[PDB]
Amino acid sequence: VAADPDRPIWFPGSTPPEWLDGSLPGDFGFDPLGLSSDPDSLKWNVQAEIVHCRWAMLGAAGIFIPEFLTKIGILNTPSWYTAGEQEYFTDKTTLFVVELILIGWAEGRRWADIIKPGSVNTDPVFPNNKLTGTDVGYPGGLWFDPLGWGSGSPAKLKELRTKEIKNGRLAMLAVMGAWFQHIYTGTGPIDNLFAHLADPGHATIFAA
Amino acid sequence: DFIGSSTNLIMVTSTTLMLFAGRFGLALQTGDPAGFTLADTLACGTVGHIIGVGVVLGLKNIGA
Amino acid sequence: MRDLKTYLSVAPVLSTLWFGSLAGLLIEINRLFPDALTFPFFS
Amino acid sequence: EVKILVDRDPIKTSFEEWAKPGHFSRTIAKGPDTTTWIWNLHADAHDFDSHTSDLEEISRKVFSAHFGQLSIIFLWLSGMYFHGARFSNYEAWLSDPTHIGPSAQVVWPIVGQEILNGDVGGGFRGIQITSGFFQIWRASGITSELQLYCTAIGALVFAALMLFAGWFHYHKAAPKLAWFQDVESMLNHHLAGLLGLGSLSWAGHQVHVSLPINQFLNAGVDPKEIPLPHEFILNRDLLAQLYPSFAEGATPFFTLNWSKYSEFLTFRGGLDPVTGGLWLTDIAHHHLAIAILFLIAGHMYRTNWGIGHGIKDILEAHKGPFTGQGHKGLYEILTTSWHAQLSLNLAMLGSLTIIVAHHMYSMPPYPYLATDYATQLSLFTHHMWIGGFLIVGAAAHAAIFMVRDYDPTNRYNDLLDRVLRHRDAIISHLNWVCIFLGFHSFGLYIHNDTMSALGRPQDMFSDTAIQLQPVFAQWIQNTHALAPGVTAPGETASTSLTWGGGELVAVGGKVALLPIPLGTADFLVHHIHAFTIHVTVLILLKGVLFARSSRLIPDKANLGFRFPCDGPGRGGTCQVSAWDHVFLGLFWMYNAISVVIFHFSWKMQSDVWGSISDQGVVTHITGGNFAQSSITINGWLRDFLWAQASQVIQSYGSSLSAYGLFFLGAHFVWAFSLMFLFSGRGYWQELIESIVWAHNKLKVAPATQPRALSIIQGRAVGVTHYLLGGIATTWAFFLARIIAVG
Amino acid sequence: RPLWFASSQSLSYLDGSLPGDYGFDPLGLSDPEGTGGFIEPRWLAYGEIINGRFAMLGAAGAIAPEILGKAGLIPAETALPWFQTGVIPPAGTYTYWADNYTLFVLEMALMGFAEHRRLQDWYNPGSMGKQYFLGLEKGLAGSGNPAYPGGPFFNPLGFGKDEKSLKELKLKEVKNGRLAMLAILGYFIQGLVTGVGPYQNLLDHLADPVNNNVLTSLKFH
Ligand code: CLA
Ligand code: CLA
Ligand code: CLA
Ligand code: CLA
Ligand SMILES: CC1=C(C/C=C(\C)CCC[C@H](C)CCC[C@H](C)CCCC(C)C)C(=O)c2ccccc2C1=O
Ligand code: SF4
Structure with a gap:
């Protein structure tokens, strides 16, 4: 969490804000509105960015890879937009409740980890297990980090964490792009890509 | 405006009358011996145009 | 911002937030459960 | 001389002062020891003359506040144009506007309020609006809903622009005092640049867009078949097919051959008999002439160059013989005081709103306005009320000038001093003529009432018993009917058809403003109006003049403009303040405008509005019962109030049911107001302290100490609830009455 | 210095320091008394120079x-006037390789990079060279003045070797630029009244100057 007073910023020539010292993994000074002016607000928004990034990366994968390995690498996936209409071995409201009960556990542990920085590291069933994560948002445990890559020098760790949220930010953008595409456009995202690569001019958002 | 007609002659005479009233005995800096600015001639010619249109489009309604 | 949240917590802003949320609640109840005069559950 | 003196970054954009309420004042920016504090936080919110002492910050504050007001109005017009675009039957109202109710609001079906969405017409369920936006849009040649949505988006854009403008002109680059005080340039621009160029650009719209579109809409063309407006700009053949003078372009203009422009710039005064509104051909020429006039008028005041009247040089030039120095000093008390200017502009803008109300019924300028009796009535009533309120505020702000910004030492005036010297003469003669008018206008109603109750209808002041004919108004009426001729040739008809020699403009089944006959009832009610206006001016002028000193309180200015009293001494000196005078003048403005709009509604429904069958026999809404029943108060109670309130109270289970609901509710709010006007603070503070004992017994003692309302606040709450209740009663009554029988 | 329509107020602050000044400020927008926001003599001279350069590019293009x-030399289809090229589809749209609006987004993105960097050299000129921009940030320094960077990407071959030469060149620049701005205004008003291209408006004048002027063409279209 070492500051970088001369880091490259979102808007070169601008003076980045005081509350973004360069310490964070990937802080290019982009906070015009001041939504992280407070310290605790910043600490919360960091984990919000992290988990929105990770959920959005899983989402972008589960949208495009089933849409890339369906149009060319032939498979059978219904869609990403209308997958909620499809049927499975469970009622639609039932498995929603089940994944709520199962995700709310982990998210409550996360809530505890954010409020109290180190509180949930012991496995409540097997207290010999542990998560060796000092940094909030980055639990260095076996189930999350079995390969030992989430440790080491803080500079390598910082460049790796900004790599993470860099992929995650455009993952967020890509997922809401697929949203707005499947709304404005009828077909799916990879089909939109092929229609753009056919004629980049007369294939865009514009239709009039 | 088909120069030489009655409307055009009346208009030029009115405009020159107002410019003359401005230059000699009033009613864009020192460029005339009488202190007649570009704004002064603009004003005098504009009011000349006003009286000219008034007298012209009217000698039209009654008379000419 | 701390002061923006201090203003959002002021009595009129918080009152209109609270009563907008409450009014949406009662509105959606009177749309989902309209025209209600008697409580029929365990009646 | 004049310049753009403006200083950068004076104030920081920050929520830090949002978090600290009451920051603007010293006593308010320390905490709520009491509950009155919050009432003082809103009361003094826009009292910028009390926050600071320098006029520079005040001028910046009010400038950006005006920008906020304009943002609000742009957002309001955005709402109106949008609701017209999406939630309206305007696209259907153009087809059959004489039978489809103009509606632009739909309610949500939740709790049975979907009854409000009624059979307005046009295959559409909504609320029959009475704003006249549909009539404007037919006068603007809209002929669509896309244009309305685009207008709403553009208005939202201008709202955001004005919001940014207020922020920029307070926080980023705020003008200093030399900029506002250059009133010469301000008048030169607002005359020529706002009103001149604004009327010119509207004349351009009226010539290019409204006129050609209304030439088809009135000629039985469906809006889907009409060419778009820009097709007249792109293709001049289509525009010339109806007005061939466009084929010559501006060569008729620049050669002063304007005689070949009368196809679209007319003087044929009167109403278009196909739709009842004024000729748009006349309105284009109108706004054009107004552009010329304001353009030559906005080059009157010296700004930077040797030409132009310095307003000081105009005012100082006028110095009366026994009127003293005259108008010297006024440029310094108007340019160093916002309250004086506010009072002047409020008075004139209010009387102008009233003149708008008066000229919008007698010369209907929009198509299908005169036949939308709800729109006509509502617009007259609205603008009358706005005018009364603006005049009453002009009084309040004249008083605030006299208390705060009036300084006979530095910012001296002579005429104001002369007015203050013989203020007792002014108020004495006004207090007399008010009594004279009261007697000889309302005691006449009482006389008619008694004579009719004693069985002596031959002794009333009626059109049958004792003639009180408006001879002067009848003469003006008859000479304005016979005005087309020797006095006003080239007009082809009267400028209005509200005069006896005029004619009836039959539009559909409706009548749309035939002549108005003036009888004894009009005499009586017009003197009632003069009476109520004179009493309002008595109260308000008295407050203004005695704002500083009286024989009772000679140091009233030190007590302030807005103070309750100076104790029970001197027999009692309640409401000596000019604030309390304007608080009373509010009630008298209410009585005045209420009887005015009653006169309007009844005279219209009895002598003007109605329905004319194809045989030509016009039957009015009431049946001509004004000149016989409006001579006694029992007629207003019976034939106007009791009878015409048979459509607001019978409207239960109908589409007009919110009108009866607000009828009863506004009744209630008025009566509730009487709890405040009649009572006093001390009773409520003692009651509050009793229930505060009841709270402290339960550890629920609030730290913001519960205080009864301040006296002036009780008076404010009383007058605002009283006005709101009487006015919403009248609004509901009028709207339901006039939408039902229509 | 020459004073063509110079007010007494104007020349108090127009001391010849600017390139190509003649005292012409009858209104007084360049008065330094206050004048924050965008109305200020520095930003006003900068905007003069920039609108002049863009107007030169316009009047040429x-x-x-x-x-x-x-x-x-040029084909017939790619020879439309300024107002039938596609900038006004109400007047005409040539079918380029892309849609008319993706080209506008191209303009926005590319000139957004360029012009926001220009702005951030206007505010603090020490930047554009402290931040990595694909290595070409070395010549984007904007040495001494915002209107005149002089970098190797804007002034590759030296012309301001002497301040006399640079002053005369800036004077010629602002003069040609003001002339091009007046030219663009002429283009717009001529296409507004005549609905025809500016070179055709020149040829109709050169053929018969009497019946082809502003006077006889006061009738529009
Ligand atoms: C999930 C949303 C989200 C959240 C909570 C954050 C949170 C944060 N970001 Mg990240 N960021 C995100 C998304 C997000 N980011 C994305 C998608 C981008 C690329 C566009 C970036 C690019 C970025 C940069 C370049 C930098 C940050 C930084 C920061 C920190 C300070 C700014 C702040 O207070 O943000 C709080 C943000 C919010 C509360 C979210 C805003 C919510 C409003 C309602 C948005 C509405 C408008 C929006 C444009 C509409 C979205 C449409 C979409 C489809 C495009 C903070 C930890 C700075 C930092 O310190 O880095 C560590 C920094 O330098 N962010
Ligand atoms: C004080 C006098 C009074 C009374 C007694 C009522 C009573 C009623 N009105 Mg009337 N009304 C009044 C004044 C009054 N109104 C006034 C002044 C107006 C004008 C503003 C109206 C206008 C009006 C309309 C227009 C309508 C009503 C309707 C209703 C009914 C509402 C039923 C409903 O939706 O609630 C259902 C309950 C709720 C909305 C509350 C939910 C509370 C939440 C869920 C918390 C509770 C759960 C909590 C967790 C605890 C559970 C236990 C455990 C966990 C411990 C009810 C008969 C509606 C109706 O159907 O008429 C018959 C209707 O259409 N009223
Ligand atoms: C209907 C209720 C009512 C009546 C009759 C009055 C009457 C009056 N008010 Mg008041 N006023 C009222 C309500 C009323 N007010 C309310 C509710 C408010 C609250 C804001 C005010 C506020 C108020 C102020 C603030 C002012 C007045 C003024 C006036 C006077 C103007 C009329 C006048 O003297 O002419 C003659 C009298 C009348 C028109 C009243 C009706 C009398 C009839 C015609 C004849 C009476 C019979 C006759 C004398 C025979 C006597 C018989 C014998 C047995 C006794 C008068 C004293 C103004 C004033 O004093 O200056 C003029 C003034 O400044 N009033
Ligand atoms: C009540 C309206 C009002 C008033 C009196 C002022 C007054 C002022 N503004 Mg403010 N401003 C306003 C509205 C207003 N502004 C709005 C609505 C915006 C947002 C769009 C701004 C944005 C703004 C900025 C950003 C700046 C000012 C500046 C200024 C100052 C000098 C302006 C000048 O000399 O003109 C110069 C005018 C021009 C060079 C012409 C501009 C050309 C535009 C494109 C067209 C203008 C015509 C207009 C839109 C009407 C046509 C409508 C169209 C549809 C045909 C002066 C204190 C400047 C200043 O000194 O700071 C205080 C400054 O930097 N203002
Ligand atoms: C009723 C009355 C009062 C008492 C009026 C009181 C103080 C108003 C009642 C309290 C208001 C309604 C504030 C309470 C609401 C707060 C915002 C708290 C919110 C609580 C929930 C409703 C959210 C006066 O002080 C008075 C003074 C002079 C002449 C006449 C009168 C008078 O008639
Ligand atoms: S009653 Fe009220 S207003 Fe009148 S003197 Fe007493 S305190 Fe003052």
Whole structure:
């Protein structure tokens, strides 16, 4: 969490804000509105960015890879937009409740980890297990980090964490792009890509 | 405006009358011996145009 | 911002937030459960 | 001389002062020891003359506040144009506007309020609006809903622009005092640049867009078949097919051959008999002439160059013989005081709103306005009320000038001093003529009432018993009917058809403003109006003049403009303040405008509005019962109030049911107001302290100490609830009455 | 210095320091008394220079499809006037390789990079060279003045070797730029009244100057 007073910023020539010292993994000074002016607000928004990034990366994968390995690498996936209409071995409201009960556990542990920085590291069933994560948002445990890559020098760790949220930010953008595409456009995202690569001019958002 | 007609002659005479009233005995800096600015001639010619249109489009309604 | 949240917590802003949320609640109840005069559950 | 003196970054954009309420004042920016504090936080919110002492910050504050007001109005017009675009039957109202109710609001079906969405017409369920936006849009040649949505988006854009403008002109680059005080340039621009160029650009719209579109809409063309407006700009053949003078372009203009422009710039005064509104051909020429006039008028005041009247040089030039120095000093008390200017502009803008109300019924300028009796009535009533309120505020702000910004030492005036010297003469003669008018206008109603109750209808002041004919108004009426001729040739008809020699403009089944006959009832009610206006001016002028000193309180200015009293001494000196005078003048403005709009509604429904069958026999809404029943108060109670309130109270289970609901509710709010006007603070503070004992017994003692309302606040709450209740009663009554029988 | 229509107020602050000044400020927008926001003498001179350069590019490009479009060098379809090219589809849209709006987004993105960097050299000129921009940030320094960077990407071959030469060149610049701005205004008003290209408006005048002027063409279209 070492500051970088001369880091490259979102808007070169601008003076980045005081509350973004360069310490964070990937802080290019982009906070015009001041939504992280407070310290605790910043600490919360960091984990919000992290988990929105990770959920959005899983989402972008589960949208495009089933849409890339369906149009060319032939498979059978219904869609990403209308997958909620499809049927499975469970009622639609039932498995929603089940994944709520199962995700709310982990998210409550996360809530505890954010409020109290180190509180949930012991496995409540097997207290010999542990998560060796000092940094909030980055639990260095076996189930999350079995390969030992989430440790080491803080500079390598910082460049790796900004790599993470860099992929995650455009993952967020890509997922809401697929949203707005499947709304404005009828077909799916990879089909939109092929229609753009056919004629980049007369294939865009514009239709009039 | 088909120069030489009655409307055009009346208009030029009115405009020159107002410019003359401005230059000699009033009613864009020192460029005339009488202190007649570009704004002064603009004003005098504009009011000349006003009286000219008034007298012209009217000698039209009654008379000419 | 701390002061923006201090203003959002002021009595009129918080009152209109609270009563907008409450009014949406009662509105959606009177749309989902309209025209209600008697409580029929365990009646 | 004049310049753009403006200083950068004076104030920081920050929520830090949002978090600290009451920051603007010293006593308010320390905490709520009491509950009155919050009432003082809103009361003094826009009292910028009390926050600071320098006029520079005040001028910046009010400038950006005006920008906020304009943002609000742009957002309001955005709402109106949008609701017209999406939630309206305007696209259907153009087809059959004489039978489809103009509606632009739909309610949500939740709790049975979907009854409000009624059979307005046009295959559409909504609320029959009475704003006249549909009539404007037919006068603007809209002929669509896309244009309305685009207008709403553009208005939202201008709202955001004005919001940014207020922020920029307070926080980023705020003008200093030399900029506002250059009133010469301000008048030169607002005359020529706002009103001149604004009327010119509207004349351009009226010539290019409204006129050609209304030439088809009135000629039985469906809006889907009409060419778009820009097709007249792109293709001049289509525009010339109806007005061939466009084929010559501006060569008729620049050669002063304007005689070949009368196809679209007319003087044929009167109403278009196909739709009842004024000729748009006349309105284009109108706004054009107004552009010329304001353009030559906005080059009157010296700004930077040797030409132009310095307003000081105009005012100082006028110095009366026994009127003293005259108008010297006024440029310094108007340019160093916002309250004086506010009072002047409020008075004139209010009387102008009233003149708008008066000229919008007698010369209907929009198509299908005169036949939308709800729109006509509502617009007259609205603008009358706005005018009364603006005049009453002009009084309040004249008083605030006299208390705060009036300084006979530095910012001296002579005429104001002369007015203050013989203020007792002014108020004495006004207090007399008010009594004279009261007697000889309302005691006449009482006389008619008694004579009719004693069985002596031959002794009333009626059109049958004792003639009180408006001879002067009848003469003006008859000479304005016979005005087309020797006095006003080239007009082809009267400028209005509200005069006896005029004619009836039959539009559909409706009548749309035939002549108005003036009888004894009009005499009586017009003197009632003069009476109520004179009493309002008595109260308000008295407050203004005695704002500083009286024989009772000679140091009233030190007590302030807005103070309750100076104790029970001197027999009692309640409401000596000019604030309390304007608080009373509010009630008298209410009585005045209420009887005015009653006169309007009844005279219209009895002598003007109605329905004319194809045989030509016009039957009015009431049946001509004004000149016989409006001579006694029992007629207003019976034939106007009791009878015409048979459509607001019978409207239960109908589409007009919110009108009866607000009828009863506004009744209630008025009566509730009487709890405040009649009572006093001390009773409520003692009651509050009793229930505060009841709270402290339960550890629920609030730290913001519960205080009864301040006296002036009780008076404010009383007058605002009283006005709101009487006015919403009248609004509901009028709207339901006039939408039902229509 | 020459004073063509110079007010007494104007020349108090127009001390010859600016390039190509003649005292012409009858209104007084360049008065330094206060004048924050965008109205200030520095930003006003900068905007003069920038609108002049863009107007030079305009007056060259709005008529290059006509001064050498009728000469035969350019094809006929790619020879429309400034107002039938596609900037006004109400007047005409040429079908370029892309849609008319993706080209506008191209303009926005590319000139957004360029012009926001220009702005951030206007505010603090020490930047544009402290931040990595694909290595070409070395010549984007904007040495001494915002209107005149002089970098190797804007002034590759030296012309300001002497301040006399640079002053005379800036004077010629602002003069040609003001002339091009007046030219663009002429283009717009001529296409507004005549609905025809500016070079054709020149040829109709050169053929018969009497019946082809502003006077006889006061009738529009
Ligand atoms: C999930 C949303 C989200 C959240 C909570 C954050 C949170 C944060 N970001 Mg990240 N960021 C995100 C998304 C997000 N980011 C994305 C998608 C981008 C690329 C566009 C970036 C690019 C970025 C940069 C370049 C930098 C940050 C930084 C920061 C920190 C300070 C700014 C702040 O207070 O943000 C709080 C943000 C919010 C509360 C979210 C805003 C919510 C409003 C309602 C948005 C509405 C408008 C929006 C444009 C509409 C979205 C449409 C979409 C489809 C495009 C903070 C930890 C700075 C930092 O310190 O880095 C560590 C920094 O330098 N962010
Ligand atoms: C004080 C006098 C009074 C009374 C007694 C009522 C009573 C009623 N009105 Mg009337 N009304 C009044 C004044 C009054 N109104 C006034 C002044 C107006 C004008 C503003 C109206 C206008 C009006 C309309 C227009 C309508 C009503 C309707 C209703 C009914 C509402 C039923 C409903 O939706 O609630 C259902 C309950 C709720 C909305 C509350 C939910 C509370 C939440 C869920 C918390 C509770 C759960 C909590 C967790 C605890 C559970 C236990 C455990 C966990 C411990 C009810 C008969 C509606 C109706 O159907 O008429 C018959 C209707 O259409 N009223
Ligand atoms: C209907 C209720 C009512 C009546 C009759 C009055 C009457 C009056 N008010 Mg008041 N006023 C009222 C309500 C009323 N007010 C309310 C509710 C408010 C609250 C804001 C005010 C506020 C108020 C102020 C603030 C002012 C007045 C003024 C006036 C006077 C103007 C009329 C006048 O003297 O002419 C003659 C009298 C009348 C028109 C009243 C009706 C009398 C009839 C015609 C004849 C009476 C019979 C006759 C004398 C025979 C006597 C018989 C014998 C047995 C006794 C008068 C004293 C103004 C004033 O004093 O200056 C003029 C003034 O400044 N009033
Ligand atoms: C009540 C309206 C009002 C008034 C009196 C002022 C007054 C002022 N503004 Mg403010 N401003 C306003 C509205 C207003 N502004 C709005 C609505 C915006 C947002 C769009 C701004 C944005 C703004 C900025 C950003 C700046 C000012 C500046 C200024 C100052 C000098 C302006 C000048 O000399 O003109 C110069 C005018 C021009 C060079 C012409 C501009 C050309 C535009 C494109 C067209 C203008 C015509 C207009 C839109 C009407 C046509 C409508 C169209 C549809 C045909 C002065 C204190 C400047 C200043 O000194 O700071 C205080 C400054 O930097 N203002
Ligand atoms: C009723 C009355 C009062 C008492 C009026 C009181 C103080 C108003 C009642 C309290 C208001 C309604 C504030 C309470 C609401 C707060 C915002 C708290 C919110 C609580 C929930 C409703 C959210 C006066 O002080 C008075 C003074 C002079 C002449 C006449 C009168 C008078 O008639
Ligand atoms: S009653 Fe009220 S207003 Fe009148 S003197 Fe007493 S305190 Fe003052």
